[PDB]
């Protein structure tokens, strides 16, 4: 981590459910103790139904995400809609081959008609792990227990929304580098849905 | 910063006789307090009646022995299966060691065989290639225990010339037994390779700690 | 174009054997590693190779330490018809027994001699290499190489690696028809000094004083040998070399 | 036939014709001659008659000093000789720097021949249409050295040699009038022999002749027009006296 | 024909011409099929002729219409190998433009890029031009419906409508007469199906003898997507007037 | 799939590593005069004390190009990188302009840098050498 | 006459669709002397007739050892034989060094085919002009391979290449069932090979100077007999 | 005209009519090769090759004329043997790389496109030669059964039935008849019998021949490429012999 | 059925219809244009002898170097283009010195000959797979005479094709045919050194246009103890006088 750089202190969650996947995050960017950006969209789209969230160095993850989006556009021009596994593999290759020079961590969420919604996590170092749900960031450490106690397979859309909202609200409550609004993207067969929740709503949970 | 070196803690001994040579070593491989293995040979037959040992960092010694054997293979290919003499092997090993002058192998190397007159010959190498022919050379841990034991019973100046192979083997075994008694890194076995005009013969003797 | 196709057609990369140098060093393709007139030296692929080498060369096993040439007194001078080179043969014992006596002076050619006075491996290796270079030059030019040319070759070579870690101080002594008898001193810092009298060792002031007391150009061969032996004895048995136009002659303890 | 279109083709009788064509190009240059004496070397050159409006003070001479003890003359294309001479001078200085010893005459001849040979090893390059005479003395040596180099990279050692236009007549004259058993023992004899050799082809006389003399300890002297005129007049007077009898 | 050189490489003849370029032009009519491109109010339609004389061929694998990006379609006149080569390079160009400049590649910029590559081929001695003609269609977010054509000589230009093939003159004359009659440089219709039907009708009256659903290929570009129609869609368009 | 260039350090050194400038007197040693570098620059000094960003900047564009070729190989096949490399090599090999150092127009078109400027474009930049014949010898391999 | 216009290089087809430089390279094999190879379920042998420049010269080496379990014999050009033998030695060495593995004979044939095909489709070089016979013993038993420099490799029980090799090949075809079952008796197989190569002789007699033999097998490392070592087989 | 003089000595040259004569000469080289056919059935493909008998010295199991590119992809070719081997190796490399990258067997059209681009790249420069082989390949993927034919120009198409080699005309006529007589489709076993019949009929040239057949079907081989055992091959040979006589 | 022109003999990488490379043949023809060199191998050493063709009497006598010292135990004689032989000799000397440097022993004569032939192969693909180094084959032939402990006294012939032979006696150059016939007639395994020298002088005198003397001929020999030496003009003149007396005895 180079001196004077920008780090992605955040709270990232991705949960698979009955009809698809949901990716949620907070909206705070901090330099030290100063909130450099009060309203940030951390949900990065690399393909129509393949989204990601980033951690570590902001510049490195932005460059990696740009390269991944370019790669997936080439793949689509050749073979059509890629699977989430392919995007995860490209992310992993980029993160692992450059790990001695870049600090990047990625959470990838995707949907396709074959695999029906998937979550992959690539922590610092470049290893890849496929999980029914994933949490990352500085504020995730405070919700390792809660999530482990409240996740069920094949939850409905509303139950998944409530679970993500509660978990991210707790992470916001306890982590200094996290705050603002909660953003969520729902990836299903019916399309892409965007959700935003305000502090006056989730702080009362 | 990454440290590319290590230490494995062995003991080797080379002795040149009238018409034979002997290279022996303890067979214990350790990592600084723990026993990795109780039987791991470090003295290797390299062909053309040449025995080699590279004691110290085990990876470097294995690499050096591998490179020397491949070079000998190409030497046989390119020179009508000519026998490689001991002095030529010593020069090859000097070049192999000095090729890593700025990133040296962390080993002490001893080779043994017979010269062109049929007499026993032993060569010792410094880690960056400096080498010389010697009658007797002890290397590694407990060398300071092994050399005085040999000097107490042999006049290198019964004279060493008139000693037989069995007597040399017994003397090496006695010195290694004493060193095993006095040193914590020596033990678990001793392996001796003997080079004569009939070839290379192997002997093994169990030491303390099994 | 087919080579380009091969480059993009899919184990070898991890072994790093797609590089020709790695294949040559491990003797995969042949014994070309032992065919280089200028030897190739491995360097750590990091930002600070010099600091790495210096740190790792000063840290446990006595047998894994780089052997250092004896700092014992070495003397050389030129009287009237050659060069007297004198060393003390008091070898230092260790955990070994020598089959024969060691020599502190390297015999580069039947006409050239050198002294170690530094790192033993550096002196041995590079003076053997210098002997090869001199042999090739003499084959090419059909004439004995001048001592100035040989010393200049050695100095240029050691200067190309200046600061890398080498350590060697040598005295190149020779006798040619055009030059006469000549002595040069070459150091690992690139120094190259021509001289008449050289004394390098632990105690060399005493030997230099004894020489200056009774040095003349009209010395005879026996007188010069006696003076060199006496100077070495004053410094601190004694190996002598007399260099003439026809080569060097070795005296054990004369 | 179809065998003279490249430098990399052998003819069925074992010839490379482009080398012979480069020699043909050399044959059109002005004559050059070199005579080796007992203790000196003399290089003579033929110069085309200077035009009336030509500035005869700054044009390069036909004999160039490679070093303080070696001189070089050429015959053939004048522009290629500049490249060769510059490379020779750079090599002499490089050798002095590398080995602290100035080059020997044979070493410099071999370097020039090596450059000429190296310029015959590609289909995209043109060989030098130049043949050279290299003269001098080895350092701390008193044996005169004279060598000839050819466009193909072949060099030879001579006691007296002529190259260029009408060099066969001069070579026959030298063979008749030069013996290695008794080489000329003084600089004057060598210069007179060189002048008489050049006078067999030179149309006008003393104004189309250039002479350089090399002597040991790096003594290189270019003779003036007046001395060459004196030599020519002496030779003509001797010839007239011989014919009068 | 070329006398000495100019039969292998692209250098000037005594008349100032490049014979290899002209021969590459003549190579574009080998397939002996025609294509037409027209613009609607919010769509662009390309219609190409399918000829499958061989009964052993699989008709679904025969196509000269390619999808380059989300918004750009391409039609190629000429042999199919160079067509596929050009298609792959165009896909790479569009993707690299999007990566490098942060927004989608416009149709005219891609046409200019391909034309510059063709200029390279026309000037370098050891490179040959591709014997194909490329037509790019899209609905640009700034310029609206767009048709741009590029040829082996490196020349590119935009069209209100265009036709290419061995019978391009007849279709061009028919289109010119229609645009004279209507005094509008496009088609005044609100759906791309009507534009497709109009293009089919124009092709039928120009070429003659009509065709079935298996002799035609139709690609349609909207503001969001370029898509190729299937045999059933073409059958519906033929049935619907 | 590299973003920042990697493996930029030398692993071996020798006195004949620069084939272009080698001494004719001693072929195993470099020619100091014809190097024209000040005369007091041993090769060892080039192995230490470099700016960390220099290797990254010197190899940046080659690394991006290699990543693009690798992506083409993964998505398109062997033929696409083969053809790109063949085009670039033909263009580079047919150009020989000893009096200028600027890149050709066709090279810029192939690199997709027709309307792009970097500091290499703005800043493109003796007794012996630097002549046409040295460039001829280096280009032809003689 | 029309062939004279389309045989300049290896990147040119004639109007009839023929690659003449490769055909000429194949024809170059006939200029070499005859070599025979054969094998059984346990051993594989090569027999070679060697030629000398004249009475005062030595005889050419026709059998080259690649590895302790594999070797070959040549018929054709000398430079290409040297190149291919060195390449096979390098491949065997790489296999042994990297994997501690013995290179299979099939793998060696595939590598030779890959290296040979390249020179027949690119400008600037020429096709190889040597035929090779490769014998070896590996985990699948004994193997004999015939390599043709067009880039082709065939696996056979026996074969012969070189000038006037048709008689030896006919003899091997006629007596296949005999030598295919010679297991555990190297001498019988070697004698069968010598008799097979005797069919290709024309005004020539096998001597200790012009006969070379090689054998490989289960317990037999690849061994070459020359001189008096073949006197027992004459 | 089949022979284009002045435009047939270089690979990447256009004729005045816009033709590439070296590619056509490679096509003529293909047309002299051995007959090969491929048939597409309702759920798979069948390949058939007319092998020519050789000496008994050949090891029977080590000389197969149908190459397996991958577990679901099989191919045959007619033309030059080295070119066919090279193209098969390239196809194997492409399939392996695709399976490594995307963790699924490569679809047949993607493989066809990669092979076709590789073939087409060899018609672009004068330093290479067009491939002298025509290839019939195919297999089964998630979308079903695919059969393709690829030509020296890089042109490839999907086929209901494909034929190449000397006996291509008769084989193509028989394939057209088979397609006409079965508008609904065909089964794998009927395809094998008809492939044997067509190979037998196409043969017209004193030389004894054998037959090789290969299957790839979902119902018969679980979507994998297999050879024909003794029983099915013998039955197909009997059917073909009944057809001939 | 018409007479046209064939052009298969102009490129080094072009096959004739029968599979021949005619540029190698033409290089051998270039070899035959050079002067004559004769080598005879016996049990007491190897003798080499060359003819000096001086086009002009002004040429320096001690300037034609057809016999060179590759190493103390290895000498060479050359015939053909001298510029190529210069490079070959430099390569051979480098190989010998490098072998001594890395193995502390003399290199075998056959190993040196093989290295020279591998260099001569460089107009095509190298022995170790190297790229082409030169545009045409060499136009020189070499006679390499040496002694080693493994094989005694050996004489090898090296050709531009990259192939070498071992010979008891061998002649190359312009007058190689008659000289080789004489060597076939007059060589036996029990020759002495002086008899070999006399035979070399006799064959050179037979095959030389000019009258043989100490100035147009040169002799050299290699032996185990004295190494490789080239006889001065006085010794060769004495040998020629002895040969003349022996011839006049009959």
From Swiss-Prot, chain B:
Main localization category: cytoplasm
Keywords from the named record: Cytoplasm, Nucleus, Proteasome
Any GO BP: proteasome-mediated ubiquitin-dependent protein catabolic process
Disulfide bonds: none
Subcellular location: Cytoplasm; Nucleus
Matching SUPFAM superfamilies: N-terminal nucleophile aminohydrolases (Ntn hydrolases)
Top-level taxon in the UniProt lineage: Eukaryota
GO cellular component, one term: proteasome complex
InterPro entries: Ntn_hydrolases_N, Proteasome_bsu_CS, Proteasome_sua/b, Proteasome_suB-type
Subunit record text: The 26S proteasome consists of a 20S proteasome core and two 19S regulatory subunits. The 20S proteasome core is composed of 28 subunits that are arranged in four stacked rings, resulting in a barrel-shaped structure. The two end rings are each formed by seven alpha subunits, and the two central rings are each formed by seven beta subunits. The catalytic chamber with the active sites is on the inside of the barrel.
Protein family: Belongs to the peptidase T1B family.
Biological function: Non-catalytic component of the proteasome which degrades poly-ubiquitinated proteins in the cytoplasm and in the nucleus. It is essential for the regulated turnover of proteins and for the removal of misfolded proteins. The proteasome is a multicatalytic proteinase complex that is characterized by its ability to cleave peptides with Arg, Phe, Tyr, Leu, and Glu adjacent to the leaving group at neutral or slightly basic pH. It has an ATP-dependent proteolytic activity.
Full protein name: Proteasome subunit beta type-6
Recorded name of the encoding gene: PRE7
From Swiss-Prot, chain F:
Any single biological process term in GO: DNA damage response
Free-text description of this protein's post-translational modifications in UniProt: Seems to be degraded by the proteasome upon its formation.
UniProt-annotated stretches for the region Disordered: 1-35
Keyword Magnesium: no
CC per GO annotation: cytoplasm; nucleus
Keywords: Chaperone
Composition bias, Polar residues: 8-26
Stated role: Short-lived chaperone present in the precursor form of the 20S proteasome and absent in the mature complex. Required for the correct assembly and enzymatic activation of the proteasome. Also prevents premature processing of the PRE2 propeptide.
Further facts: Present with 2740 molecules/cell in log phase SD medium.
Family under the similarity heading: Belongs to the POMP/UMP1 family.
Protein name according to UniProt: Proteasome maturation factor UMP1
Species name: Saccharomyces cerevisiae (strain ATCC 204508 / S288c)
Gene: UMP1
From Swiss-Prot, chain G:
Family: Belongs to the peptidase T1A family.
One Gene Ontology cellular component annotation held by this UniProt entry: proteasome core complex, alpha-subunit complex
Pfam families for this protein: Proteasome, Proteasome_A_N
Other observations noted: Present with 7210 molecules/cell in log phase SD medium.
Crosslink site: Glycyl lysine isopeptide (Lys-Gly) (interchain with G-Cter in ubiquitin): 191
Protein keywords: Cytoplasm, Isopeptide bond, Nucleus, Phosphoprotein, Proteasome, Ubl conjugation
Purpose of the protein: The proteasome degrades poly-ubiquitinated proteins in the cytoplasm and in the nucleus. It is essential for the regulated turnover of proteins and for the removal of misfolded proteins. The proteasome is a multicatalytic proteinase complex that is characterized by its ability to cleave peptides with Arg, Phe, Tyr, Leu, and Glu adjacent to the leaving group at neutral or slightly basic pH. It has an ATP-dependent proteolytic activity.
Record's subunit section: The 26S proteasome consists of a 20S proteasome core and two 19S regulatory subunits. The 20S proteasome core is composed of 28 subunits that are arranged in four stacked rings, resulting in a barrel-shaped structure. The two end rings are each formed by seven alpha subunits, and the two central rings are each formed by seven beta subunits. The catalytic chamber with the active sites is on the inside of the barrel.
Gene field: PRE5
PANTHER family cross-referenced by the UniProt entry: PROTEASOME SUBUNIT ALPHA/BETA
Residues annotated with Phosphoserine modification: 14
Chief place of localization: cytoplasm
Localization per record: Cytoplasm; Nucleus
Protein name (database record): Proteasome subunit alpha type-6
SMART domains: Proteasome_A_N (SM00948)
Tree of life domain: Eukaryota
UniProtKB/Swiss-Prot annotation, chain H:
CDD domains listed in its UniProt record: proteasome_alpha_type_3 (cd03751)
Pfam families: Proteasome (PF00227), Proteasome_A_N (PF10584)
InterPro entries in UniProt: Ntn_hydrolases_N, Proteasome_alpha, Proteasome_alpha-type, Proteasome_asu_N, Proteasome_sua/b
PTM description: The alpha and beta forms are probably products of the same gene with different post-translational modifications.
Signal peptide: none
UniProt-annotated location(s): Cytoplasm; Nucleus
Cellular component, GO annotation: nucleus; proteasome complex; proteasome core complex, alpha-subunit complex; proteasome storage granule
Entry-annotated residues carrying N-acetylthreonine: 1
Gene Ontology molecular function, alphabetical: mRNA binding
Function of the molecule: The proteasome degrades poly-ubiquitinated proteins in the cytoplasm and in the nucleus. It is essential for the regulated turnover of proteins and for the removal of misfolded proteins. The proteasome is a multicatalytic proteinase complex that is characterized by its ability to cleave peptides with Arg, Phe, Tyr, Leu, and Glu adjacent to the leaving group at neutral or slightly basic pH. It has an ATP-dependent proteolytic activity.
Protein name as annotated: Probable proteasome subunit alpha type-7
Gene source species: Saccharomyces cerevisiae (strain ATCC 204508 / S288c) (Baker's yeast)
Gene expressing this chain: PRE10
């Amino acid at each position: 981590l180079k001196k004077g750089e920008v780090s992605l202190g955040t709270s990232i969650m991705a949960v698979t459910f009955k009809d698809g996947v949901i990716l949620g995050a907070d909206s705070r960017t901090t330099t030290g103790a100063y909130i450099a950006n009060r309203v940030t969209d951390k949900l990065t789209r690399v393909h129509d139904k393949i989204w990601c969230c980033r951690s570590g160095s902001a510049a490195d993850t932005q460059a990696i995400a740009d390269i991944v989006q370019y790669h997936l556009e080439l793949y689509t021009s050749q073979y059509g809609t890629p699977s989430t596994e392919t995007a995860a593999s490209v992310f992993k290759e980029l993160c692992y081959e450059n790990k001695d020079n870049l600090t990047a961590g990625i959470i990838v969420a995707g949907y396709d008609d074959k695999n029906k919604g998937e979550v992959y996590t690539i922590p610092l170092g470049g290893s890849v792990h496929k999980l029914p749900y994933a949490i990352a960031g500085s504020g995730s450490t405070f919700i390792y227990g809660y999530c482990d106690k409240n996740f069920r397979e094949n939850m409905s859309k509303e139950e998944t929304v409530d679970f993500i909202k509660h978990s991210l609200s707790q992470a916001i409550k306890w982590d200094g580098s996290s705050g603002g609004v909660i953003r969520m993207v729902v990836l299903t067969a019916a399309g892409v849905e965007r959700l935003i929740f305000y502090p006056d709503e989730y702080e009362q949970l | 910063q990454f440290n590319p070196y290590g230490d494995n803690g062995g003991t080797i001994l080379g002795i040149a006789g009238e018409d034979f040579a002997v290279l022996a070593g303890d067979t214990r491989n350790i990592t600084d307090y723990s026993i990795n293995s109780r039987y791991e040979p470090k003295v290797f037959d390299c062909g053309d009646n040449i025995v080699m040992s590279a004691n110290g960092f085990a990876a470097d010694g294995d690499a050096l022995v591998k490179r020397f054997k491949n070079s000998v293979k190409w030497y046989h290919f390119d020179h009508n299966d000519k026998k490689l003499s001991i002095n030529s092997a010593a020069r090859n090993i000097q070049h192999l060691l000095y090729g890593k002058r700025f990133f040296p192998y962390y080993v002490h190397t001893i080779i043994a065989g017979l010269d062109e007159d049929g007499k026993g010959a032993v060569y010792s190498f410094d880690p960056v290639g400096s080498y010389e022919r010697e009658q007797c050379r002890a290397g590694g841990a407990a060398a300071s225990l092994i050399m005085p034991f040999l000097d107490n019973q042999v006049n290198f100046k019964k004279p060493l010339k008139y000693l037989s192979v069995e007597e040399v083997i017994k003397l090496v075994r006695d010195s290694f037994t004493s060193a095993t008694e006095r040193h914590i890194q020596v033990g678990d076995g001793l392996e001796i390779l003997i080079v004569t005009k009939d070839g290379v013969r192997k002997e093994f003797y169990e030491l303390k700690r099994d | 174009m087919q080579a380009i196709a091969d480059s993009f057609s899919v184990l070898v990369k991890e072994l790093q054997y797609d590089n020709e140098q790695n294949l040559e060093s491990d003797f995969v393709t042949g014994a070309s590693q032992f065919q280089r007139l200028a030897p190739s030296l491995t360097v750590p692929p990091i930002a600070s190779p010099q600091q790495f080498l210096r740190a790792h060369t000063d840290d446990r096993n006595p047998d894994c330490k780089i052997k250092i040439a004896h700092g014992t007194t070495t003397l050389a001078f030129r009287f009237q018809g050659g060069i007297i080179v004198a060393v003390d043969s008091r070898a230092t014992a260790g955990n070994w027994v020598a089959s024969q006596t060691v020599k502190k002076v390297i015999e580069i050619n039947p006409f050239l001699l050198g002294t170690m006075a530094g790192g033993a491996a550096d002196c041995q290796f590079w003076e053997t290499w210098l002997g090869s270079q001199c042999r090739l030059h003499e084959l090419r030019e059909k004439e004995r190489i001048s001592v100035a040319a040989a010393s200049k070759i050695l100095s240029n070579l050691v200067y190309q690696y200046k600061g890398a870690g080498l350590s060697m101080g040598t005295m190149i002594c020779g006798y040619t028809r055009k030059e006469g008898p000549t002595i040069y001193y070459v150091d690992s810092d690139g120094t190259r000094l021509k001289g008449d009298i050289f004394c390098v060792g632990s105690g060399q002031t005493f030997a230099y004083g004894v020489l200056d007391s009774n040095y003349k150009w009209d010395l005879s061969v026996e007188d010069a040998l006696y003076l060199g032996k006496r100077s070495i004895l004053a410094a601190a048995s004694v190996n002598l070399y007399h260099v003439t136009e026809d080569g060097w002659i070795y005296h054990g303890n004369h | 036939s179809g065998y003279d279109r490249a430098l990399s083709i052998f003819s069925p009788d074992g010839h490379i014709f482009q080398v012979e064509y480069a020699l043909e190009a050399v044959k059109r240059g002005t004559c050059a001659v070199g005579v080796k004496g007992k203790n000196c070397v003399v290089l003579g050159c033929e110069r085309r008659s200077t035009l009336k409006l030509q500035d005869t003070r700054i044009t390069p001479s036909k004999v160039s000093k490679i070093d303080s003890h070696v001189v070089l003359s050429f015959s053939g294309l004048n522009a290629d000789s500049r490249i060769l001479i510059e490379k020779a001078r750079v090599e002499a200085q490089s050798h002095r720097l590398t080995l602290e010893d100035p080059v020997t005459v044979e070493y410099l001849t071999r370097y020039v021949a090596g450059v000429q040979q190296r310029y015959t090893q590609s289909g995209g390059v043109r060989p030098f249409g130049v043949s050279t005479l290299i003269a001098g003395f080895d350092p701390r040596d008193d044996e005169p050295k004279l060598y000839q180099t050819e466009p193909s990279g072949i060099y030879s050692s001579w006691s007296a040699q002529t190259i260029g236009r009408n060099s066969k007549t001069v070579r026959e004259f030298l063979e008749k009038n030069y013996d290695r058993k008794e080489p000329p023992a003084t600089v004057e004899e060598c210069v007179k022999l060189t002048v008489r050799s050049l006078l067999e082809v030179v149309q006008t006389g003393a104004k189309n002749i250039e002479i350089t003399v090399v002597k040991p300890d790096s003594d290189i002297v270019a003779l003036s027009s007046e001395e060459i005129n004196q030599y020519v007049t002496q030779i003509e007077q001797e010839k007239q006296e011989q014919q009068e009898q | 024909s070329a006398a000495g050189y100019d039969r292998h490489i692209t250098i000037f003849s005594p008349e100032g011409r490049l014979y290899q370029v002209e021969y590459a032009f003549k190579a574009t009519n080998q397939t002996n099929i025609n294509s037409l491109a027209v613009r609607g109010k919010d769509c662009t339609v390309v219609i190409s002729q399918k000829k499958v004389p061989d009964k052993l061929l699989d008709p679904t694998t025969v196509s000269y219409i390619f999808c380059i990006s989300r918004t750009i379609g391409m039609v190629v006149n000429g042999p199919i190998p160079d067509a596929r080569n050009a298609a792959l390079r165009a896909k790479a160009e569009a993707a690299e433009f999007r990566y490098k400049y942060g927004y989608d590649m416009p149709c005219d910029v891609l046409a200019k890029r391909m034309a510059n590559l063709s200029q390279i081929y026309t000037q370098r001695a050891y490179m040959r031009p591709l014997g194909v003609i490329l037509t790019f269609v899209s609905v640009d977010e700034e310029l609206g419906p767009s048709i741009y054509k590029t040829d082996p000589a490196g020349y590119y230009v935009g069209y209100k409508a265009t036709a290419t093939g061995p019978k391009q003159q007849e279709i061009t004359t028919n289109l010119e007469n229609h645009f004279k009659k209507s005094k509008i440089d496009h088609i005044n219709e609100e759906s791309w199906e009507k534009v497709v039907e109009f293009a089919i009708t124009h092709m039928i009256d120009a070429l003659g003898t009509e065709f079935s659903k298996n002799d035609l290929e139709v690609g349609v570009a909207t503001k969001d997507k370029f898509f190729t129609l299937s045999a059933e869609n073409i059958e519906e368009r033929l049935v619907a007037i | 799939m590299n973003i920042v260039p990697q493996d930029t350090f030398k692993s071996q050194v020798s006195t004949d590593q620069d084939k272009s400038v080698l001494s004719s007197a001693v072929p195993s040693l470099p020619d100091t005069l014809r190097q024209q570098e000040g005369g007091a620059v041993p090769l060892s000094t080039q192995l230490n004390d470099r700016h960390p960003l220099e290797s990254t900047l010197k190899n940046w564009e080659t690394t991006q190009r290699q990543r693009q070729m690798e992506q083409y190989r993964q998505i398109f096949g062997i033929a696409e990188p083969m053809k790109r490399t063949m085009e670039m090599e033909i263009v580079n090999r047919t150009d020989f302009n000893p009096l200028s150092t600027n890149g050709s127009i066709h090279r810029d078109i192939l690199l997709n840098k027709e309307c792009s400027i970097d500091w290499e474009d703005v800043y493109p930049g003796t007794m012996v050498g630097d002549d046409v014949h040295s460039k001829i010898e280096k280009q032809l391999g003689i | 006459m029309f062939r004279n216009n389309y045989d300049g290089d290896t990147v040119t087809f004639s109007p009839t669709g023929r690659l003449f430089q490769v055909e000429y390279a194949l024809e170059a094999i006939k200029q070499g002397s005859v070599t025979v190879g054969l094998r059984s379920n346990t051993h594989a042998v090569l027999v070679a007739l060697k030629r000398n420049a004249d009475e005062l010269s030595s005889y050419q080496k026709k059998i080259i050892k690649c590895d302790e379990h594999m070797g070959l014999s040549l018929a054709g050009l000398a430079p290409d034989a040297r190149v291919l033998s060195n390449y096979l030695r390098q491949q065997c060495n790489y296999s042994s060094l990297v994997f501690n593995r013995k290179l299979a004979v099939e793998r060696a044939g595939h590598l030779l085919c890959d290296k040979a095909q390249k020179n027949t489709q690119s400008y600037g070089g020429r096709p190889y002009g040597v035929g090779l016979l490769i014998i070896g013993y590996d985990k699948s038993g004994a193997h004999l391979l015939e390599f043709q420099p067009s880039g082709n490799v065939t696996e056979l029980y026996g074969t012969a290449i070189g000038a006037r090799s048709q008689g030896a090949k006919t003899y091997l075809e006629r007596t296949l069932d005999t030598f295919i079952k010679i297991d555990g008796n190297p001498d019988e197989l070697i004698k069968a090979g010598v008799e097979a190569i005797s069919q290709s002789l024309r005004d020539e007699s096998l001597t200790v100077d012009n006969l070379s033999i090689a054998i490989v097998g289960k317990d037999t490392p690849f061994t070459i007999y020359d001189g008096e070592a073949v006197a027992k087989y004459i | 005209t089949s022979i284009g003089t002045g435009y047939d000595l270089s690979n990447s040259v256009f004729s005045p009519d816009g033709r590439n004569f070296q590619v056509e000469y490679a096509v003529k080289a293909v047309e002299n090769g051995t007959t090969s056919i491929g048939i597409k059935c309702n759920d798979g493909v069948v390949f058939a090759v007319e092998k020519l008998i050789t000496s008994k010295l050949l090891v029977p199991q080590k000389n197969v004329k149908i190459q397996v590119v991958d577990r679901h992809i099989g191919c045959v070719y007619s033309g030059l043997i080295p070119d066919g081997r090279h193209l098969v190796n390239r196809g194997r490399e492409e399939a392996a790389s695709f399976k490594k990258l995307y963790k699924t067997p490569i679809p047949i059209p993607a493989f066809a496109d990669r092979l076709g681009q590789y073939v087409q790249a060899h018609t672009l420069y004068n330093s290479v030669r067009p491939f002298g082989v025509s290839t019939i390949f195919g297999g089964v993927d998630k979308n079903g059964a695919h059969l393709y034919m690829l030509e020296p120009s890089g042109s490839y198409w999907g086929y209901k039935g494909a034929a190449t080699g000397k006996g291509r005309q008769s084989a193509k006529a028989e394939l057209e008849k088979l397609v006409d007589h079965h508008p609904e489709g065909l089964s794998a076993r009927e395809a094998v019998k008809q492939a044997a019949k067509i190979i037998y009929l196409a043969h017209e040239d004193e030389k004894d021949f054998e037959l090789e057949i290969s299957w790839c079907s979902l119902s018969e081989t679980n979507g994998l490429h297999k050879f024909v055992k003794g029983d099915l091959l013998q039955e197909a040979i009997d059917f073909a012999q009944k057809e001939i006589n | 059925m018409f007479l046209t022109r064939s052009e298969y003999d102009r490129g080094v990488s072009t096959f004739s219809p029968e599979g021949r490379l005619f540029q190698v043949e033409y290089s051998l023809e270039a070899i035959k244009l050079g002067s004559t060199a004769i080598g005879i191998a016996t049990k007491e050493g190897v003798v080499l002898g060359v003819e000096k063709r001086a086009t002009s009497p002004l040429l320096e006598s001690d300037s034609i170097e057809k016999i060179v010292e590759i190493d103390r135990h290895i000498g060479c004689a050359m015939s053909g283009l001298t510029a190529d032989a210069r490079s070959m000799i430099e390569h051979a000397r480098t190989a010998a010195v490098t072998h001594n440097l890395y193995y502390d022993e003399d290199i075998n004569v056959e190993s040196l000959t093989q290295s020279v032939c591998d260099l001569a192969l460089r107009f095509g693909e190298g022995a170790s797979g190297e790229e082409r180094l030169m545009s045409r084959p060499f136009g020189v032939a070499l006679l390499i005479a040496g002694h080693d402990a493994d094989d005694g006294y050996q004489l090898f012939h090296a050709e531009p094709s990259g192939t070498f032979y071992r010979y008891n006696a061998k002649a190359i150059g312009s007058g190689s045919e008659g000289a080789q016939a004489e060597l076939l007639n007059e060589w036996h395994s029990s020759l002495t050194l002086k008899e070999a020298e006399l035979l070399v002088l006799k064959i050179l005198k037979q095959v030389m246009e000019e009258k043989l003397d100490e100035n147009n001929a040169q002799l050299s020999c290699i032996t185990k103890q004295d190494g490789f030496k080239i006889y001065d003009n006085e010794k060769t003149a004495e040998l020629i006088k002895e040969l003349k007396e022996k011839e006049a005895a009959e």
